[PDB]
Amino acid sequence: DISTGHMILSYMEDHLKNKNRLEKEWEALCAYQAEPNSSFVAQREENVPKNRSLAVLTYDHSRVLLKAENSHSHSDYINASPIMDHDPRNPAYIATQGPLPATVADFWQMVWESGCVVIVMLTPLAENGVRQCYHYWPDEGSNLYHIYEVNLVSEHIWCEDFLVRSFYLKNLQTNETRTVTQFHFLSWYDRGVPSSSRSLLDFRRKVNKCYRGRSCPIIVHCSDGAGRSGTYVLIDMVLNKMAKGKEIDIAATLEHLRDQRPGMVQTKEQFEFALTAVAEEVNAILAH
Ligand SMILES: [Cl-]
């Protein structure tokens, strides 16, 4: 563990500090091509409006399938990609776009059927007016999204950069009711990075003190569900490996991600950030 901390630091010296290797790797990464990588379903005429960003469409081989029988639009399609870590049965996350007005019922169906109870949201809803994600929850009281009643139970504001919202999610078909906890990071702007890595890391720690430990996937979204969402996942997967002890390849770990959803980590600056974040956390642990 501390052992693996020093192993990560060694890696950081060769891949974060050496700017040449950063570039080279990112250049490698940009050209990297997943196989398979078809997204024919996502590119159907019928699913065009269910996609926010034409640049980031879920692969046919790695998409969440809504149960068409319970679907709002009688369709299985949602732009969400399961993301496996250890286990090919149980994906650790579902990365998905910011739900659109057209797809909110769908987003909740995926939350219900995935058994998900922790959501991570890494965008504000608007950026100097530029919409990122539809306001898919009620700011007070109850809203109905198809057969999914969502009630806002409470809302806890930790700091300038993040808050938590607690929901009750009732399936009106089955009369069941679950608590879904939504972690909302507010200072991570489109195609950019947080100013404080310390905030994003504490935010992560809070996400995981609440998740620990559940079968169901964490639902991570932002905008395209690639850039920020992927930097989170990448940062979070690499520290989990430290969490449980040998070898470390962050570039290779990112490939594993891009095998499962295109676009993951949109910028070299974001990649640089994910690295800097892992390093800083590992500097803190080892300091103690
Ligand atoms: Cl089909």
Residue numbers in the entry: 724 to 968, 970 to 1012
In the authors' words:
Protein tyrosine phosphatases (PTPs) play a critical role in regulating cellular functions by selectively dephosphorylating their substrates. The ∼280 residue PTP catalytic domain consists of an α/β structure, and biochemical and structural studies have led to a detailed understanding of the catalytic mechanism (Barford et al., 1994; Zhang, 2002). Key features of the domain include the PTP signature motif, the mobile Trp-Pro-Asp “WPD” loop that in the closed conformation positions the conserved and catalytically important aspartate residue, and the phosphotyrosine recognition loop. Here we report the crystal structures of 22 PTP domains, including two tandem-domain RPTP structures and a detailed structural comparison of this protein family.
In the second category are PTPs in which both the gateway and the second-site loop are open and accessible as found in the R8 pseudophosphatase group (IA2, IA2β) but a cysteine residue occupies the position of Arg24. Surprisingly, sedimentation velocity measurements showed that all single-domain RPTPs studied (IA2, IA2β, GLEPP1, DEP1, and STEP) were entirely monomeric in solution, as were tandem-domain receptor PTPs (RPTPα, CD45, RPTPɛ, and RPTPμ).
